Design a protein around this nucleic acid. Structure first.
Lengths: 226, 224, 226
DNA sequence: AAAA
DNA sequence: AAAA
DNA sequence: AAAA
């Protein structure tokens, strides 16, 4: 099967490792063997003017996903929200309460459905393609998340005297002359990876290391040789 | 310590990666250093006539484990159900209510005890060996699960014009000229593996890749 | 950031892999890149006269961390307890009930607070350093745990006709000629490790293998050649 | 629910 | 809450 | 509870 998925991830961190704002929203097309993506879109946010409790991320995710989906016509869209695979077009207050989720999760999504449910309904009317909230269960979602990490590092390289990027969960990045590679650190996932072309700037040093306050998350730090 | 454990696993999947039915029930003997098994039994189900919500799996498991136990006389039997290590022979509705599990889990075992508890009682009487529901905690149970995976692939090799097999959680298989090797993909488990001798047919291609719908589960695909 | 963390870990096991008692309490200093510690303290317990239930451990940990902290003046102390990051000086009957932890945990810490809360208060008054119950989230706590493992093996080597050591969760140890190395087995953690100097006695053999009754925990076993 |  |  |  052919799947379009999206995720928002990558954060600017302050010096005590507290998130300031998110960076990259990515939509990816994933096909067999479901390890990477060769066709994807990115939209950068402004992390210094970001509402971390604003939940603009998922609105960005579905729009980018639909934009990619219109170009490549997948079998399904995977949205990063763990609701058990329920179709977003079937999302009303009735079906939300029946979900096996937290009370906070139910109230976040009753408010979100007001824009997203009509969006998904119209896209389905147009194409027959469902938008499903599968979240943690989805491999395409994890691949989008890996790419959000890569594009965040690409963003950091392009916008740096010092920057701390908090990567999405247990992934690493590698810097090469003409590209950035991102890989899951979890071998249980079966070797998920991504790769993006970019020019790596001069006069900067970088390091990748564990976030001391959030175990299994890495930090990518850029410093100027100044 | 010498342990017999059992598990059912491996599923035939349709073209949209949905499970059709389970394949292999395996009982293993596990001994020090507790990384693999050299002595085991397999039972094949019919995945095309299987009730996934039917729980013949756990019934198959205890029977097979008992069959193996009678032959190799272990210290204990491990059953793949996470109930905190309570003896199956001591499982009645009284002790079931006290178990710290979901009510769905409670209603499942109220039904199961009716058959299994007398069996465990009878088996304990004969041998002194306990049958304990330990599940996720047991390394022998995970080694059986890995073997279930290997045997599912063997099943795939024996019945292939094209098949998709969903393996148990995060394990890989490698096919060599005369055998199938299965390994946990989780280095935290400390290097669990299994190996089965089988004849590999000619004229086939196979591939192993992530189930796109079930993260950390792999798919084994084989074509003629 | 500079962090002091502490943990109690390592157990003597009987022949059927049941824990008899714990071995090592360690405080560690962790600095960038937050993968290991080069400065640490250990206190060994008597595993054969130990009350597993319990809580002499946390008392030892906070004492040991304060002792290390006085020497190295960290930014914060992490105690191995997952309470959401609440300062131990702020632990009273009111705030303990507000914690999203089990009813068992709440009644336990109302008892612990009577000794620990004044201790953290006095230390904060003196230095401005908070002692926080962060637990599972802290990389420094995980590094302390690894060191607890290493020191537990050192203890076994120094006190061994046969010993079984149950290590902390998913870590391995390597014996070298003049030292013991400990490593996390989880690559998602980003390569956490430790190293402790010791003399390896003669006339003994060792093996590392899975604890069959506790999945993802390893056993370090020592046997005499006599 | 999501984020580091 | 912690421990193997 | 188990299965992918």
């Amino acid at each position: 099967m052919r799947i379009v998925a999206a995720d928002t991830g990558g954060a600017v961190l302050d010096e005590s490792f507290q998130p300031v704002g998110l960076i990259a929203t990515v939509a990816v097309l994933v096909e067999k063997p479901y390890k990477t993506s060769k066709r994807f879109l990115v939209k950068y946010a402004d992390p210094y003017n970001y509402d971390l409790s604003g939940r603009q991320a998922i609105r960005d995710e579905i729009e980018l996903a639909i934009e990619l989906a219109r170009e490549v016509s997948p079998d399904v869209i995977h949205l990063n929200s763990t609701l058990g695979g329920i179709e977003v077009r079937k999302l009303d207050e009735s079906t939300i309460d029946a979900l096996q989720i937290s009370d906070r999760g139910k109230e976040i999504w009753k408010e979100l459905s007001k824009d997203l449910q009509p969006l998904a309904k119209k896209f389905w009317e147009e194409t027959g393609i469902e938008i499903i909230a599968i979240g943690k269960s989805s491999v395409p979602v994890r691949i989008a998340e890996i790419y959000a990490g890569i594009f965040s590092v690409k963003w950091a390289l392009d916008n740096v005297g010092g920057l701390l990027v908090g990567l999405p969960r247990y992934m690493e990045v590698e810097i090469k002359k003409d590209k950035i590679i991102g890989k899951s650190l979890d071998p249980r996932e079966g070797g998920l990876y991504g790769e993006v072309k970019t020019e790596v700037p001069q006069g900067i040093k970088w390091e990748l290391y564990p976030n001391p306050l959030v175990r299994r998350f890495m930090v990518f730090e850029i410093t100027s040789k100044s």
